[PDB]
JSON list of C-alpha atoms (C1' of nucleotides) in Angstrom, two decimals:
[
{"chain": "A", "resi": 5, "resn": "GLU", "atom": "CA", "xyz": [-106.87, 32.37, 94.94]},
{"chain": "A", "resi": 6, "resn": "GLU", "atom": "CA", "xyz": [-106.26, 31.59, 98.76]},
{"chain": "A", "resi": 7, "resn": "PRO", "atom": "CA", "xyz": [-106.24, 35.24, 100.40]},
{"chain": "A", "resi": 8, "resn": "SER", "atom": "CA", "xyz": [-109.09, 37.16, 101.08]},
{"chain": "A", "resi": 9, "resn": "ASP", "atom": "CA", "xyz": [-110.74, 38.84, 97.97]},
{"chain": "A", "resi": 10, "resn": "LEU", "atom": "CA", "xyz": [-111.86, 42.63, 98.12]},
{"chain": "A", "resi": 11, "resn": "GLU", "atom": "CA", "xyz": [-115.22, 41.93, 99.18]},
{"chain": "A", "resi": 12, "resn": "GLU", "atom": "CA", "xyz": [-114.07, 39.39, 102.09]},
{"chain": "A", "resi": 13, "resn": "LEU", "atom": "CA", "xyz": [-111.55, 42.35, 103.20]},
{"chain": "A", "resi": 14, "resn": "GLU", "atom": "CA", "xyz": [-114.40, 44.65, 103.18]},
{"chain": "A", "resi": 15, "resn": "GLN", "atom": "CA", "xyz": [-116.29, 42.44, 105.57]},
{"chain": "A", "resi": 16, "resn": "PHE", "atom": "CA", "xyz": [-113.74, 41.62, 107.68]},
{"chain": "A", "resi": 17, "resn": "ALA", "atom": "CA", "xyz": [-113.18, 45.55, 108.05]},
{"chain": "A", "resi": 18, "resn": "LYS", "atom": "CA", "xyz": [-116.73, 45.87, 108.93]},
{"chain": "A", "resi": 19, "resn": "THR", "atom": "CA", "xyz": [-116.34, 42.91, 111.40]},
{"chain": "A", "resi": 20, "resn": "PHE", "atom": "CA", "xyz": [-113.38, 44.21, 113.16]},
{"chain": "A", "resi": 21, "resn": "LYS", "atom": "CA", "xyz": [-114.59, 47.63, 113.98]},
{"chain": "A", "resi": 22, "resn": "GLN", "atom": "CA", "xyz": [-117.67, 46.29, 115.09]},
{"chain": "A", "resi": 23, "resn": "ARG", "atom": "CA", "xyz": [-115.94, 43.94, 117.47]},
{"chain": "A", "resi": 24, "resn": "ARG", "atom": "CA", "xyz": [-113.43, 46.75, 118.40]},
{"chain": "A", "resi": 25, "resn": "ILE", "atom": "CA", "xyz": [-116.43, 49.21, 119.20]},
{"chain": "A", "resi": 26, "resn": "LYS", "atom": "CA", "xyz": [-118.37, 46.60, 121.12]},
{"chain": "A", "resi": 27, "resn": "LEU", "atom": "CA", "xyz": [-115.64, 45.57, 123.30]},
{"chain": "A", "resi": 28, "resn": "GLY", "atom": "CA", "xyz": [-114.68, 49.26, 124.12]},
{"chain": "A", "resi": 29, "resn": "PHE", "atom": "CA", "xyz": [-111.23, 49.74, 122.78]},
{"chain": "A", "resi": 30, "resn": "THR", "atom": "CA", "xyz": [-110.17, 53.04, 120.57]},
{"chain": "A", "resi": 31, "resn": "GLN", "atom": "CA", "xyz": [-107.98, 52.61, 117.31]},
{"chain": "A", "resi": 32, "resn": "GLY", "atom": "CA", "xyz": [-105.31, 53.42, 119.41]},
{"chain": "A", "resi": 33, "resn": "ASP", "atom": "CA", "xyz": [-105.92, 50.90, 122.16]},
{"chain": "A", "resi": 34, "resn": "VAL", "atom": "CA", "xyz": [-105.76, 47.97, 119.14]},
{"chain": "A", "resi": 35, "resn": "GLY", "atom": "CA", "xyz": [-102.85, 49.34, 117.89]},
{"chain": "A", "resi": 36, "resn": "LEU", "atom": "CA", "xyz": [-101.09, 49.23, 121.12]},
{"chain": "A", "resi": 37, "resn": "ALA", "atom": "CA", "xyz": [-102.22, 45.93, 122.07]},
{"chain": "A", "resi": 38, "resn": "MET", "atom": "CA", "xyz": [-100.75, 44.45, 118.99]},
{"chain": "A", "resi": 39, "resn": "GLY", "atom": "CA", "xyz": [-97.49, 45.44, 119.94]},
{"chain": "A", "resi": 40, "resn": "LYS", "atom": "CA", "xyz": [-98.04, 44.11, 123.41]},
{"chain": "A", "resi": 41, "resn": "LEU", "atom": "CA", "xyz": [-99.70, 40.78, 122.40]},
{"chain": "A", "resi": 42, "resn": "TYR", "atom": "CA", "xyz": [-98.23, 39.88, 119.13]},
{"chain": "A", "resi": 43, "resn": "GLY", "atom": "CA", "xyz": [-94.88, 41.97, 118.96]},
{"chain": "A", "resi": 44, "resn": "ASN", "atom": "CA", "xyz": [-95.65, 44.53, 115.95]},
{"chain": "A", "resi": 45, "resn": "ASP", "atom": "CA", "xyz": [-97.44, 47.79, 117.37]},
{"chain": "A", "resi": 46, "resn": "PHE", "atom": "CA", "xyz": [-99.47, 49.61, 114.54]},
{"chain": "A", "resi": 47, "resn": "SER", "atom": "CA", "xyz": [-100.36, 53.55, 114.90]},
{"chain": "A", "resi": 48, "resn": "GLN", "atom": "CA", "xyz": [-103.94, 54.98, 115.48]},
{"chain": "A", "resi": 49, "resn": "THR", "atom": "CA", "xyz": [-103.56, 56.19, 111.89]},
{"chain": "A", "resi": 50, "resn": "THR", "atom": "CA", "xyz": [-102.84, 52.58, 110.43]},
{"chain": "A", "resi": 51, "resn": "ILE", "atom": "CA", "xyz": [-105.98, 51.10, 112.08]},
{"chain": "A", "resi": 52, "resn": "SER", "atom": "CA", "xyz": [-108.29, 53.86, 110.93]},
{"chain": "A", "resi": 53, "resn": "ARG", "atom": "CA", "xyz": [-107.10, 53.21, 107.27]},
{"chain": "A", "resi": 54, "resn": "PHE", "atom": "CA", "xyz": [-107.22, 49.58, 107.73]},
{"chain": "A", "resi": 55, "resn": "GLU", "atom": "CA", "xyz": [-110.91, 50.00, 109.10]},
{"chain": "A", "resi": 56, "resn": "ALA", "atom": "CA", "xyz": [-111.71, 52.27, 106.00]},
{"chain": "A", "resi": 57, "resn": "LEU", "atom": "CA", "xyz": [-109.91, 50.62, 103.73]},
{"chain": "A", "resi": 58, "resn": "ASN", "atom": "CA", "xyz": [-107.86, 53.30, 103.13]},
{"chain": "A", "resi": 59, "resn": "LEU", "atom": "CA", "xyz": [-104.70, 51.18, 101.95]},
{"chain": "A", "resi": 60, "resn": "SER", "atom": "CA", "xyz": [-104.17, 49.28, 98.61]},
{"chain": "A", "resi": 61, "resn": "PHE", "atom": "CA", "xyz": [-105.27, 45.86, 98.51]},
{"chain": "A", "resi": 62, "resn": "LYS", "atom": "CA", "xyz": [-101.80, 44.73, 98.65]},
{"chain": "A", "resi": 63, "resn": "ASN", "atom": "CA", "xyz": [-101.40, 46.58, 101.93]},
{"chain": "A", "resi": 64, "resn": "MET", "atom": "CA", "xyz": [-104.51, 45.72, 103.20]},
{"chain": "A", "resi": 65, "resn": "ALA", "atom": "CA", "xyz": [-103.84, 41.70, 102.49]},
{"chain": "A", "resi": 66, "resn": "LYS", "atom": "CA", "xyz": [-100.43, 42.11, 104.70]},
{"chain": "A", "resi": 67, "resn": "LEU", "atom": "CA", "xyz": [-102.37, 43.61, 107.42]},
{"chain": "A", "resi": 68, "resn": "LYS", "atom": "CA", "xyz": [-105.73, 41.54, 107.75]},
{"chain": "A", "resi": 69, "resn": "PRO", "atom": "CA", "xyz": [-103.75, 38.15, 109.05]},
{"chain": "A", "resi": 70, "resn": "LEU", "atom": "CA", "xyz": [-102.25, 40.58, 112.00]},
{"chain": "A", "resi": 71, "resn": "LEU", "atom": "CA", "xyz": [-105.26, 42.17, 112.90]},
{"chain": "A", "resi": 72, "resn": "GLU", "atom": "CA", "xyz": [-106.89, 38.59, 112.66]},
{"chain": "A", "resi": 73, "resn": "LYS", "atom": "CA", "xyz": [-104.73, 37.38, 115.75]},
{"chain": "A", "resi": 74, "resn": "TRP", "atom": "CA", "xyz": [-106.08, 40.26, 117.94]},
{"chain": "A", "resi": 75, "resn": "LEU", "atom": "CA", "xyz": [-109.70, 39.64, 116.76]},
{"chain": "A", "resi": 76, "resn": "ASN", "atom": "CA", "xyz": [-109.88, 36.13, 117.61]},
{"chain": "A", "resi": 77, "resn": "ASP", "atom": "CA", "xyz": [-107.99, 36.55, 121.04]},
{"chain": "A", "resi": 78, "resn": "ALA", "atom": "CA", "xyz": [-110.00, 39.67, 121.89]},
{"chain": "A", "resi": 79, "resn": "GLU", "atom": "CA", "xyz": [-112.99, 37.33, 121.99]},
{"chain": "A", "resi": 110, "resn": "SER", "atom": "CA", "xyz": [-87.02, 62.43, 113.85]},
{"chain": "A", "resi": 111, "resn": "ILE", "atom": "CA", "xyz": [-84.94, 64.78, 112.45]},
{"chain": "A", "resi": 112, "resn": "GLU", "atom": "CA", "xyz": [-84.44, 68.20, 113.92]},
{"chain": "A", "resi": 113, "resn": "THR", "atom": "CA", "xyz": [-86.03, 71.61, 112.33]},
{"chain": "A", "resi": 114, "resn": "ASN", "atom": "CA", "xyz": [-82.55, 73.18, 112.06]},
{"chain": "A", "resi": 115, "resn": "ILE", "atom": "CA", "xyz": [-80.81, 70.27, 110.77]},
{"chain": "A", "resi": 116, "resn": "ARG", "atom": "CA", "xyz": [-83.28, 69.78, 107.93]},
{"chain": "A", "resi": 117, "resn": "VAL", "atom": "CA", "xyz": [-82.57, 73.17, 106.68]},
{"chain": "A", "resi": 118, "resn": "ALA", "atom": "CA", "xyz": [-78.76, 72.66, 106.74]},
{"chain": "A", "resi": 119, "resn": "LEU", "atom": "CA", "xyz": [-79.54, 69.21, 105.06]},
{"chain": "A", "resi": 120, "resn": "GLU", "atom": "CA", "xyz": [-81.34, 70.78, 102.26]},
{"chain": "A", "resi": 121, "resn": "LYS", "atom": "CA", "xyz": [-78.58, 73.52, 101.68]},
{"chain": "A", "resi": 122, "resn": "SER", "atom": "CA", "xyz": [-76.32, 70.77, 101.53]},
{"chain": "A", "resi": 123, "resn": "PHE", "atom": "CA", "xyz": [-78.53, 68.57, 99.05]},
{"chain": "A", "resi": 124, "resn": "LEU", "atom": "CA", "xyz": [-78.57, 71.94, 96.79]},
{"chain": "A", "resi": 125, "resn": "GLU", "atom": "CA", "xyz": [-74.58, 72.07, 96.84]},
{"chain": "A", "resi": 126, "resn": "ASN", "atom": "CA", "xyz": [-74.31, 68.21, 95.90]},
{"chain": "A", "resi": 127, "resn": "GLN", "atom": "CA", "xyz": [-77.39, 65.90, 95.38]},
{"chain": "A", "resi": 128, "resn": "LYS", "atom": "CA", "xyz": [-75.22, 62.91, 95.77]},
{"chain": "A", "resi": 129, "resn": "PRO", "atom": "CA", "xyz": [-72.55, 63.14, 98.49]},
{"chain": "A", "resi": 130, "resn": "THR", "atom": "CA", "xyz": [-69.97, 60.28, 98.61]},
{"chain": "A", "resi": 131, "resn": "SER", "atom": "CA", "xyz": [-70.03, 57.49, 101.71]},
{"chain": "A", "resi": 132, "resn": "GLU", "atom": "CA", "xyz": [-66.92, 60.34, 102.90]},
{"chain": "A", "resi": 133, "resn": "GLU", "atom": "CA", "xyz": [-68.50, 63.34, 102.18]},
{"chain": "A", "resi": 134, "resn": "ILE", "atom": "CA", "xyz": [-71.55, 61.98, 104.01]},
{"chain": "A", "resi": 135, "resn": "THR", "atom": "CA", "xyz": [-69.60, 60.81, 107.23]},
{"chain": "A", "resi": 136, "resn": "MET", "atom": "CA", "xyz": [-68.40, 64.30, 107.37]},
{"chain": "A", "resi": 137, "resn": "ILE", "atom": "CA", "xyz": [-71.83, 65.66, 107.33]},
{"chain": "A", "resi": 138, "resn": "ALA", "atom": "CA", "xyz": [-72.98, 63.49, 109.81]},
{"chain": "A", "resi": 139, "resn": "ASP", "atom": "CA", "xyz": [-70.44, 64.25, 112.68]},
{"chain": "A", "resi": 140, "resn": "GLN", "atom": "CA", "xyz": [-70.75, 67.72, 111.21]},
{"chain": "A", "resi": 141, "resn": "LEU", "atom": "CA", "xyz": [-74.43, 67.60, 112.31]},
{"chain": "A", "resi": 142, "resn": "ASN", "atom": "CA", "xyz": [-73.98, 65.02, 114.89]},
{"chain": "A", "resi": 143, "resn": "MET", "atom": "CA", "xyz": [-76.31, 62.77, 113.48]},
{"chain": "A", "resi": 144, "resn": "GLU", "atom": "CA", "xyz": [-76.04, 58.93, 112.91]},
{"chain": "A", "resi": 145, "resn": "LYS", "atom": "CA", "xyz": [-74.27, 58.20, 109.36]},
{"chain": "A", "resi": 146, "resn": "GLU", "atom": "CA", "xyz": [-77.05, 55.81, 108.15]},
{"chain": "A", "resi": 147, "resn": "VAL", "atom": "CA", "xyz": [-79.79, 58.34, 108.88]},
{"chain": "A", "resi": 148, "resn": "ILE", "atom": "CA", "xyz": [-77.85, 60.79, 106.78]},
{"chain": "A", "resi": 149, "resn": "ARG", "atom": "CA", "xyz": [-77.45, 58.62, 103.99]},
{"chain": "A", "resi": 150, "resn": "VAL", "atom": "CA", "xyz": [-81.02, 57.49, 103.92]},
{"chain": "A", "resi": 151, "resn": "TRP", "atom": "CA", "xyz": [-82.12, 61.08, 104.12]},
{"chain": "A", "resi": 152, "resn": "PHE", "atom": "CA", "xyz": [-80.12, 61.86, 100.81]},
{"chain": "A", "resi": 153, "resn": "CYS", "atom": "CA", "xyz": [-81.68, 58.77, 99.51]},
{"chain": "A", "resi": 154, "resn": "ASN", "atom": "CA", "xyz": [-84.96, 60.09, 100.25]},
{"chain": "A", "resi": 155, "resn": "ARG", "atom": "CA", "xyz": [-84.28, 63.50, 98.92]},
{"chain": "A", "resi": 156, "resn": "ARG", "atom": "CA", "xyz": [-82.92, 62.35, 95.57]},
{"chain": "A", "resi": 157, "resn": "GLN", "atom": "CA", "xyz": [-86.00, 60.28, 95.21]},
{"chain": "A", "resi": 158, "resn": "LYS", "atom": "CA", "xyz": [-88.14, 63.19, 95.95]},
{"chain": "A", "resi": 159, "resn": "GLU", "atom": "CA", "xyz": [-86.72, 65.17, 93.64]},
{"chain": "A", "resi": 160, "resn": "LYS", "atom": "CA", "xyz": [-87.82, 62.66, 90.53]},
{"chain": "A", "resi": 161, "resn": "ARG", "atom": "CA", "xyz": [-91.69, 62.80, 91.70]},
{"chain": "A", "resi": 162, "resn": "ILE", "atom": "CA", "xyz": [-94.08, 64.44, 89.37]},
{"chain": "A", "resi": 163, "resn": "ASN", "atom": "CA", "xyz": [-94.91, 66.86, 92.22]},
{"chain": "B", "resi": 6, "resn": "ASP", "atom": "CA", "xyz": [-131.13, 66.02, 107.40]},
{"chain": "B", "resi": 7, "resn": "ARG", "atom": "CA", "xyz": [-127.31, 65.15, 107.69]},
{"chain": "B", "resi": 8, "resn": "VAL", "atom": "CA", "xyz": [-126.28, 63.25, 110.60]},
{"chain": "B", "resi": 9, "resn": "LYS", "atom": "CA", "xyz": [-124.17, 64.37, 113.62]},
{"chain": "B", "resi": 10, "resn": "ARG", "atom": "CA", "xyz": [-121.35, 62.30, 115.00]},
{"chain": "B", "resi": 11, "resn": "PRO", "atom": "CA", "xyz": [-121.94, 60.89, 117.99]},
{"chain": "B", "resi": 12, "resn": "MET", "atom": "CA", "xyz": [-121.36, 62.82, 121.21]},
{"chain": "B", "resi": 13, "resn": "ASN", "atom": "CA", "xyz": [-118.03, 61.92, 123.59]},
{"chain": "B", "resi": 14, "resn": "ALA", "atom": "CA", "xyz": [-117.65, 61.20, 126.78]},
{"chain": "B", "resi": 15, "resn": "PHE", "atom": "CA", "xyz": [-116.87, 65.08, 127.63]},
{"chain": "B", "resi": 16, "resn": "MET", "atom": "CA", "xyz": [-119.80, 66.40, 125.28]},
{"chain": "B", "resi": 17, "resn": "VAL", "atom": "CA", "xyz": [-122.16, 64.14, 126.86]},
{"chain": "B", "resi": 18, "resn": "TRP", "atom": "CA", "xyz": [-120.88, 64.87, 130.58]},
{"chain": "B", "resi": 19, "resn": "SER", "atom": "CA", "xyz": [-120.82, 68.65, 129.80]},
{"chain": "B", "resi": 20, "resn": "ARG", "atom": "CA", "xyz": [-124.31, 68.50, 128.48]},
{"chain": "B", "resi": 21, "resn": "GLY", "atom": "CA", "xyz": [-125.52, 67.75, 131.95]},
{"chain": "B", "resi": 22, "resn": "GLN", "atom": "CA", "xyz": [-122.70, 69.53, 133.76]},
{"chain": "B", "resi": 23, "resn": "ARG", "atom": "CA", "xyz": [-122.58, 72.64, 131.37]},
{"chain": "B", "resi": 24, "resn": "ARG", "atom": "CA", "xyz": [-126.45, 73.15, 132.62]},
{"chain": "B", "resi": 25, "resn": "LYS", "atom": "CA", "xyz": [-125.57, 72.83, 135.88]},
{"chain": "B", "resi": 26, "resn": "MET", "atom": "CA", "xyz": [-123.02, 75.43, 135.99]},
{"chain": "B", "resi": 27, "resn": "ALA", "atom": "CA", "xyz": [-125.39, 77.83, 134.15]},
{"chain": "B", "resi": 28, "resn": "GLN", "atom": "CA", "xyz": [-128.05, 77.57, 136.79]},
{"chain": "B", "resi": 29, "resn": "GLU", "atom": "CA", "xyz": [-125.50, 78.20, 139.66]},
{"chain": "B", "resi": 30, "resn": "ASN", "atom": "CA", "xyz": [-123.44, 80.63, 136.95]},
{"chain": "B", "resi": 31, "resn": "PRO", "atom": "CA", "xyz": [-126.45, 81.98, 134.89]},
{"chain": "B", "resi": 32, "resn": "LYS", "atom": "CA", "xyz": [-124.19, 85.16, 134.20]},
{"chain": "B", "resi": 33, "resn": "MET", "atom": "CA", "xyz": [-120.89, 83.43, 133.22]},
{"chain": "B", "resi": 34, "resn": "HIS", "atom": "CA", "xyz": [-120.28, 83.23, 129.50]},
{"chain": "B", "resi": 35, "resn": "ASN", "atom": "CA", "xyz": [-120.24, 80.03, 128.34]},
{"chain": "B", "resi": 36, "resn": "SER", "atom": "CA", "xyz": [-116.53, 81.00, 127.21]},
{"chain": "B", "resi": 37, "resn": "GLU", "atom": "CA", "xyz": [-115.26, 80.69, 130.84]},
{"chain": "B", "resi": 38, "resn": "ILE", "atom": "CA", "xyz": [-117.61, 78.05, 131.71]},
{"chain": "B", "resi": 39, "resn": "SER", "atom": "CA", "xyz": [-115.83, 76.03, 129.15]},
{"chain": "B", "resi": 40, "resn": "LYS", "atom": "CA", "xyz": [-112.70, 76.72, 130.54]},
{"chain": "B", "resi": 41, "resn": "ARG", "atom": "CA", "xyz": [-113.50, 75.89, 134.19]},
{"chain": "B", "resi": 42, "resn": "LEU", "atom": "CA", "xyz": [-115.15, 72.62, 133.16]},
{"chain": "B", "resi": 43, "resn": "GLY", "atom": "CA", "xyz": [-112.25, 71.34, 131.32]},
{"chain": "B", "resi": 44, "resn": "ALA", "atom": "CA", "xyz": [-110.48, 72.26, 134.21]},
{"chain": "B", "resi": 45, "resn": "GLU", "atom": "CA", "xyz": [-112.56, 70.20, 136.39]},
{"chain": "B", "resi": 46, "resn": "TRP", "atom": "CA", "xyz": [-113.04, 67.45, 133.79]},
{"chain": "B", "resi": 47, "resn": "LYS", "atom": "CA", "xyz": [-109.27, 66.91, 133.83]},
{"chain": "B", "resi": 48, "resn": "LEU", "atom": "CA", "xyz": [-109.41, 66.52, 137.65]},
{"chain": "B", "resi": 49, "resn": "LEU", "atom": "CA", "xyz": [-112.04, 63.34, 137.70]},
{"chain": "B", "resi": 50, "resn": "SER", "atom": "CA", "xyz": [-110.44, 59.87, 137.90]},
{"chain": "B", "resi": 51, "resn": "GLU", "atom": "CA", "xyz": [-110.85, 57.30, 135.35]},
{"chain": "B", "resi": 52, "resn": "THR", "atom": "CA", "xyz": [-113.37, 55.40, 137.44]},
{"chain": "B", "resi": 53, "resn": "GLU", "atom": "CA", "xyz": [-115.32, 58.47, 137.85]},
{"chain": "B", "resi": 54, "resn": "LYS", "atom": "CA", "xyz": [-115.02, 59.01, 134.27]},
{"chain": "B", "resi": 55, "resn": "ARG", "atom": "CA", "xyz": [-115.47, 55.56, 133.17]},
{"chain": "B", "resi": 56, "resn": "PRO", "atom": "CA", "xyz": [-119.57, 55.91, 133.57]},
{"chain": "B", "resi": 57, "resn": "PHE", "atom": "CA", "xyz": [-119.43, 58.51, 131.01]},
{"chain": "B", "resi": 58, "resn": "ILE", "atom": "CA", "xyz": [-116.93, 56.93, 128.83]},
{"chain": "B", "resi": 59, "resn": "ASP", "atom": "CA", "xyz": [-119.42, 53.57, 128.64]},
{"chain": "B", "resi": 60, "resn": "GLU", "atom": "CA", "xyz": [-122.05, 55.95, 127.91]},
{"chain": "B", "resi": 61, "resn": "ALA", "atom": "CA", "xyz": [-120.40, 57.64, 125.11]},
{"chain": "B", "resi": 62, "resn": "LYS", "atom": "CA", "xyz": [-119.60, 54.04, 123.74]},
{"chain": "B", "resi": 63, "resn": "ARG", "atom": "CA", "xyz": [-123.17, 52.96, 124.20]},
{"chain": "B", "resi": 64, "resn": "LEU", "atom": "CA", "xyz": [-124.46, 56.12, 122.37]},
{"chain": "B", "resi": 65, "resn": "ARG", "atom": "CA", "xyz": [-121.92, 55.52, 119.74]},
{"chain": "B", "resi": 66, "resn": "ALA", "atom": "CA", "xyz": [-122.78, 51.94, 119.39]},
{"chain": "B", "resi": 67, "resn": "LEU", "atom": "CA", "xyz": [-126.49, 52.89, 119.40]},
{"chain": "B", "resi": 68, "resn": "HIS", "atom": "CA", "xyz": [-125.97, 55.46, 116.87]},
{"chain": "B", "resi": 69, "resn": "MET", "atom": "CA", "xyz": [-124.01, 53.07, 114.53]},
{"chain": "B", "resi": 70, "resn": "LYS", "atom": "CA", "xyz": [-127.46, 51.10, 114.72]},
{"chain": "B", "resi": 71, "resn": "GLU", "atom": "CA", "xyz": [-129.30, 54.15, 113.36]},
{"chain": "B", "resi": 72, "resn": "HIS", "atom": "CA", "xyz": [-126.79, 54.62, 110.50]},
{"chain": "B", "resi": 73, "resn": "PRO", "atom": "CA", "xyz": [-124.69, 51.50, 109.89]},
{"chain": "B", "resi": 74, "resn": "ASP", "atom": "CA", "xyz": [-123.43, 52.88, 107.01]},
{"chain": "B", "resi": 75, "resn": "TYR", "atom": "CA", "xyz": [-122.31, 56.39, 108.39]},
{"chain": "B", "resi": 76, "resn": "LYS", "atom": "CA", "xyz": [-118.97, 57.51, 107.95]},
{"chain": "B", "resi": 77, "resn": "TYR", "atom": "CA", "xyz": [-117.04, 60.33, 109.48]},
{"chain": "B", "resi": 78, "resn": "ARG", "atom": "CA", "xyz": [-116.00, 62.45, 106.53]},
{"chain": "B", "resi": 79, "resn": "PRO", "atom": "CA", "xyz": [-114.08, 65.83, 107.32]},
{"chain": "B", "resi": 80, "resn": "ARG", "atom": "CA", "xyz": [-113.95, 68.87, 105.11]},
{"chain": "B", "resi": 81, "resn": "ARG", "atom": "CA", "xyz": [-110.61, 69.55, 104.30]},
{"chain": "B", "resi": 82, "resn": "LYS", "atom": "CA", "xyz": [-109.49, 73.21, 103.82]},
{"chain": "C", "resi": 1, "resn": "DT", "atom": "C1'", "xyz": [-125.57, 85.05, 112.61]},
{"chain": "C", "resi": 2, "resn": "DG", "atom": "C1'", "xyz": [-120.78, 84.68, 114.19]},
{"chain": "C", "resi": 3, "resn": "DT", "atom": "C1'", "xyz": [-117.57, 85.22, 117.78]},
{"chain": "C", "resi": 4, "resn": "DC", "atom": "C1'", "xyz": [-115.13, 82.33, 121.24]},
{"chain": "C", "resi": 5, "resn": "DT", "atom": "C1'", "xyz": [-114.68, 78.16, 124.60]},
{"chain": "C", "resi": 6, "resn": "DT", "atom": "C1'", "xyz": [-113.83, 73.03, 126.22]},
{"chain": "C", "resi": 7, "resn": "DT", "atom": "C1'", "xyz": [-112.26, 67.79, 125.32]},
{"chain": "C", "resi": 8, "resn": "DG", "atom": "C1'", "xyz": [-112.18, 63.23, 122.46]},
{"chain": "C", "resi": 9, "resn": "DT", "atom": "C1'", "xyz": [-112.10, 61.08, 117.86]},
{"chain": "C", "resi": 10, "resn": "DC", "atom": "C1'", "xyz": [-110.89, 60.30, 112.84]},
{"chain": "C", "resi": 11, "resn": "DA", "atom": "C1'", "xyz": [-108.28, 61.43, 108.29]},
{"chain": "C", "resi": 12, "resn": "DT", "atom": "C1'", "xyz": [-104.45, 63.83, 106.01]},
{"chain": "C", "resi": 13, "resn": "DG", "atom": "C1'", "xyz": [-99.52, 65.45, 104.72]},
{"chain": "C", "resi": 14, "resn": "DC", "atom": "C1'", "xyz": [-94.79, 64.87, 105.12]},
{"chain": "C", "resi": 15, "resn": "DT", "atom": "C1'", "xyz": [-90.96, 61.98, 107.01]},
{"chain": "C", "resi": 16, "resn": "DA", "atom": "C1'", "xyz": [-87.85, 57.83, 107.76]},
{"chain": "C", "resi": 17, "resn": "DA", "atom": "C1'", "xyz": [-87.14, 53.25, 107.15]},
{"chain": "C", "resi": 18, "resn": "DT", "atom": "C1'", "xyz": [-87.20, 48.58, 104.60]},
{"chain": "C", "resi": 19, "resn": "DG", "atom": "C1'", "xyz": [-86.23, 45.09, 100.74]},
{"chain": "D", "resi": 1, "resn": "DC", "atom": "C1'", "xyz": [-86.49, 51.98, 93.00]},
{"chain": "D", "resi": 2, "resn": "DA", "atom": "C1'", "xyz": [-90.73, 50.60, 95.24]},
{"chain": "D", "resi": 3, "resn": "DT", "atom": "C1'", "xyz": [-93.56, 50.48, 99.23]},
{"chain": "D", "resi": 4, "resn": "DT", "atom": "C1'", "xyz": [-95.29, 50.91, 104.37]},
{"chain": "D", "resi": 5, "resn": "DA", "atom": "C1'", "xyz": [-95.41, 53.05, 109.09]},
{"chain": "D", "resi": 6, "resn": "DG", "atom": "C1'", "xyz": [-96.04, 56.87, 112.31]},
{"chain": "D", "resi": 7, "resn": "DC", "atom": "C1'", "xyz": [-96.20, 62.07, 114.11]},
{"chain": "D", "resi": 8, "resn": "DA", "atom": "C1'", "xyz": [-98.42, 66.25, 114.18]},
{"chain": "D", "resi": 9, "resn": "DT", "atom": "C1'", "xyz": [-101.83, 69.13, 112.82]},
{"chain": "D", "resi": 10, "resn": "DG", "atom": "C1'", "xyz": [-107.21, 70.35, 111.21]},
{"chain": "D", "resi": 11, "resn": "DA", "atom": "C1'", "xyz": [-111.98, 69.56, 111.55]},
{"chain": "D", "resi": 12, "resn": "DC", "atom": "C1'", "xyz": [-116.20, 68.65, 114.04]},
{"chain": "D", "resi": 13, "resn": "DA", "atom": "C1'", "xyz": [-119.85, 67.09, 117.90]},
{"chain": "D", "resi": 14, "resn": "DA", "atom": "C1'", "xyz": [-123.35, 70.66, 121.52]},
{"chain": "D", "resi": 15, "resn": "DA", "atom": "C1'", "xyz": [-124.44, 74.47, 124.28]},
{"chain": "D", "resi": 16, "resn": "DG", "atom": "C1'", "xyz": [-124.74, 80.20, 125.48]},
{"chain": "D", "resi": 17, "resn": "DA", "atom": "C1'", "xyz": [-123.46, 84.91, 126.17]},
{"chain": "D", "resi": 18, "resn": "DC", "atom": "C1'", "xyz": [-122.06, 89.01, 123.37]},
{"chain": "D", "resi": 19, "resn": "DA", "atom": "C1'", "xyz": [-121.75, 92.39, 119.40]}
]
DNA sequence: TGTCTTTGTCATGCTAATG
DNA sequence: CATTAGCATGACAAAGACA
């Protein structure tokens, strides 16, 4: 085992939050700096989850290396379109590339966005809750 | 004894400003003063607000020293 | 006591996108 | 099919007059 184990990640989280506060940065500030300095911005939400370890060990492991560069150095779909989309889903759960292309232009929305919406919708329907 | 959250730059700045307005406006209800303070607070510059942000930051670090294991845990409705 | 008011910060739910 | 990131929303801090 080379990557940080759970206890080590908890310590890094502790350290990271201390340094952030000591330096006077908000979680949002850090998320923004990550994009400006390292090319991958993060939201305030992700920084908050990371500092609280409200993420899986798998996700914390991906993020730690990225936030470590910061630490070292510091030292949308429309409401109406949705409803219609839902109506459509009701009619046909799995529209074809052709059906889809139509629906896109019809709604004046990019094709890929629509293809993905139906994919996400079929997935949500398979959920327990 | 429950631990309360650190006061933010506005709450700290209102604690002393709120009393200043009450002495000059002791018959004004906090509901209206709270509105004028917010209006006045939005007019301060960052340099002028900085001294209040740093103090809130210091109160937050010092607050963390008293309870290093404290966690903000809001109640969901 | 609860009502009614302010700004800033943190955590959560739902949505979108990638492999 | 499985998993990650992000936006908008709700809750909480302190102090005071009014019902």
